[PDB]
Amino acid sequence: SFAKYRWCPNIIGPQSGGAVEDLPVHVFESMGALQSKIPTEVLITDRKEFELAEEGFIALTMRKGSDNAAFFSANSIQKPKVFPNTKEGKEAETNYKLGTQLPYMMIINRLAHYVKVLQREQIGAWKERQDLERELNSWIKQYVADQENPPADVRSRRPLRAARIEVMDVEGNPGWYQVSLSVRPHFKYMGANFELSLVGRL
């Protein structure tokens, strides 16, 4: 995923970058039939993988009958903490849920590796707080595509969607800057319902 888009949220797609292709297969003779040895040692069903997804596991379902496999959810082992039913608690529960999922850590781990390097060269310059606000806002807004439906390349070259930077001061020892970079990602595709019926006329 990094060799294509220079980011990594793209790890959970059977057609979108979570497909471990070109697995070794071994066609041997079964009890009468001609089958293939499964390249992962079990055939993970969809309910078993969803139960591993809730319990914090990155399972690999195998495309039964070929040499491909797929990831579906890269959830880290952290549990989504149940927050009380206030206005902020129902909000922060969905906020804390985005931390655990781990394609979204990898779009802010890079926003800890770039920004550590980029603000390491600057030590000793002639800057201001207003200059500190600008060297970060004009920097991360090449990663931000604040747009409801951009094309499929703008979504992954620019994995963020909105970013807030609030630079403050530290009193007592002046010239120490508590800034708060608040990024926000795009949202992928997971689960629906498809409640069929017939109408008869329409």
Partner: peptide
């Protein structure tokens, strides 16, 4: 330190 110390605030803030 004099280097910069990024810490993922899993928190949001008031």
């Amino acid at each position: 330190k004099e280097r910069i110390n990024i810490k993922y605030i899993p928190a949001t803030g008031d």
